Every structure is written in structure tokens, then in C-alpha cells.
Design a protein around this ligand. Structure first.
Ligand code: ZRT
Length: 290
């Protein structure tokens, strides 16, 4: 027996939004203000604006409405206009992949290790809610402040019952997923390892210049992503443990929290980086609880 999902799905009027600029297209992601009726608050939001693709975006809203954790992006509501719109909290600093790329020369060890802690906390929460993400990557981690990141993009996420089978991001998937289309929380751990490598290399592309069709044979021969320059063996060994063939001998998200937490207490024993060492009624969504 599975527990009843008593999450609320907030349907928001279209007149409650004063959508401002466009953030980025691909669909489209807007930014704007959400002003609930006569609540005297202005909440900065992001809005994601024809066919059966409506089914997918609503499957996304189902997952996002059913999560509540400081390191997971939650759905504020949907607007049922001509198009189905997803309304989420504005993450004003962008995605973490763009952030580490545009700020390499100003990111210290404490920030890198804290992000690894927070991402592991969010993933451990998803595991607690029996959620396999299947698209964990630096591009899908958003930055509320440089000290606070959250996981987003649940378009591939699936709810395990009391391994899931099935276009996918090859250079982030465990071998068993590339080969057998098998996805578990431990295959998420593999993607976590690639995501940490992304941060540790300040946004390098994993297997840059290697066709995705070759990834399965490369991983089978025993090859893995190289040790990033700033990484001590301690940190790189954690990433290598995420890439083991035996999925059960990979670290659990609850262990990665612990390990990175200890390292974040002495961040330079583990990362070697040169240089280390309107408004008025605006309320962040994390402070608007209903
Ligand atoms: C890495 C790409 C990116 O997201 N850039 C970005 C993000 C944000 N802030 C933001 N706030 C709330 C929600 C989002 N957001 C972005 C995305 C796109 N994916 C890749 C993360 C989604 C999304 C959610 C679910 C399903 C599909 C997509 N939600 N982003 C920015 O606001 C400041 C600005 C930017 N970029 C700035 C630099 O140029 C590119 C855009």
C-alpha cells in the first residue's frame, strides 16, 4: 500500500501575474511577480509557458507539487490559460552550471563543498519520497543565493512503488541505465557524481568531444572522468565511488551528506583553489506559506 498524496494543486488566476522579462527559451521560461488577490505581497516567480505536451507539463506539475524541501524547487501553482503555465520560485542567480562558469575566479572551496552538501540533502529527500530524478545535472540545479541551491527539472522523474524501465542525457547516466534502461536512486548517485565533477571543474563538459554512442563502451572498459585539478584524492575518490559498476556499492545520498559535511568544515584540506580565502511588499516564496 502506498500513502495518499494529499498535496494541493494551486490554480492561479492570470491577472495575479505581472510577468516581466523573458529569462530564456529552448519552451520558454519567463520571470515576473505573483501578487495573490488582496494579500499585500509580491512574490518573484518564474513562469514556464499546444498539443499532448500538456500531459507532460502536468506530469511535471504533479511531481513538483508533491515535494517540500529546502533544497528542492516546488511548484507554486499552475495557470490554465491558452497554454498550461508552470509557476515556480524565481531563482535569481540562475542555474549552477552557468554560475560556476561565469564565476570561476571567485568560487571558494567552502561554496563548492556546501553545494555538494545541499544537492545531496535534496536528493536524499527525493529518495525519502521514493522519487528517482533521472536528470540530475548542474544545469538542473538552481541558485537562490550563492549559499542556497535547489534541485529542479522533474520532467524525467518517476515515483517508485512499494528499478524503473523505459531521449535521455547519456553522459550523466549510470552504465546500467545506458545498457538496460534501469533507473534507481543509486543510478541518481551516479549522476550526482557527474554533477560534482561539473562543479569541481567549474563547468566542464563531461566526455567533451566523445559521441554519446561511445559512452557505453568507454564506461565498460573502465574509463571514468578525470580527477579535476582542484580536487584532492579524498574528493575525487568520493566521485569515483559514485561511478562503480555495482550500483549497491555506490554511496547513499545520506552518506554523501555526511562526507561532504565533514569536508566543508575544513574546506582547504580537500579543495586546492588559487585565491581561496516595487520592493516594499516583496516576499520570497520560501516565506509565503499557505
Ligand atoms: C541553466 C539554465 C538556467 O536555468 N538559467 C537561468 C535561470 C534563472 N532562474 C530561474 N528561476 C526559476 C526557475 C528557473 N528555471 C530554469 C529552468 C531551465 N532548466 C534548464 C534549469 C527551469 C525548468 C524547470 C523545470 C523544467 C524545465 C525547466 N526553471 N530559472 C535565471 O533567472 C535569473 C536566469 C538564467 N539564465 C541567465 C543567463 O542566460 C541564460 C538564462
Amino acid at each position: 500500500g502506498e500513502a495518499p498524496n494529499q498535496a494541493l494543486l494551486r490554480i492561479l488566476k492570470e491577472t495575479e501575474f505581472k510577468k516581466i522579462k523573458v529569462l530564456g527559451s529552448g519552451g520558454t521560461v519567463y520571470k515576473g511577480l505573483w501578487i495573490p488577490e488582496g494579500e499585500k505581497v509580491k512574490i518573484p516567480v518564474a513562469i514556464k509557458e499546444s498539443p499532448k505536451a500538456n500531459k507532460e507539463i502536468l506530469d511535471e506539475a504533479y511531481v513538483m507539487a508533491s515535494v517540500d524541501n529546502p533544497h528542492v524547487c516546488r511548484l507554486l501553482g499552475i495557470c490554465l490559460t491558452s497554454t498550461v503555465q508552470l509557476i515556480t520560485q524565481l531563482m535569481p542567480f540562475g542555474c549552477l552550471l552557468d554560475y560556476v562558469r561565469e564565476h570561476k575566479d571567485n568560487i571558494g572551496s567552502q561554496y563548492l563543498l556546501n553545494w555538494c552538501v545541499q544537492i545531496a540533502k535534496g536528493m536524499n529527500y527525493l529518495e525519502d519520497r521514493r522519487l528517482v530524478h533521472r536528470d540530475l545535472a548542474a544545469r538542473n540545479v538552481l541558485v537562490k543565493t550563492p549559499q542556497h541551491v535547489k534541485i529542479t527539472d522533474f520532467g524525467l522523474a518517476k515515483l517508485l512503488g512499494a528499478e524503473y524501465h523505459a531521449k535521455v542525457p547519456i553522459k550523466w547516466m549510470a552504465l546500467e541505465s545506458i545498457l538496460h534502461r534501469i533507473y534507481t536512486h543509486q543510478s541518481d548517485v551516479w549522476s550526482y557524481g557527474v554533477t560534482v565533477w561539473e562543479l569541481m571543474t567549474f563547468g566542464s563538459k563531461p566526455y567533451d568531444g566523445i559521441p554519446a554512442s561511445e559512452i557505453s563502451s568507454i564506461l565498460e572498459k573502465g574509463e571514468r572522468l578525470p580527477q579535476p585539478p582542484i580536487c584532492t584524492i579524498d574528493v575525487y575518490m568520493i566521485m569515483v565511488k559514485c561511478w562503480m559498476i555495482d550500483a549497491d556499492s555506490r554511496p547513499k545520498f545520506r552518506e554523501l551528506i555526511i562526507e561532504f559535511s565533514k569536508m566543508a568544515r575544513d574546506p582547504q584540506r580537500y579543495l586546492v583553489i588559487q585565491g581561496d580565502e516595487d520592493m516594499d511588499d516583496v516576499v520570497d516564496a520560501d516565506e509565503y506559506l499557505i
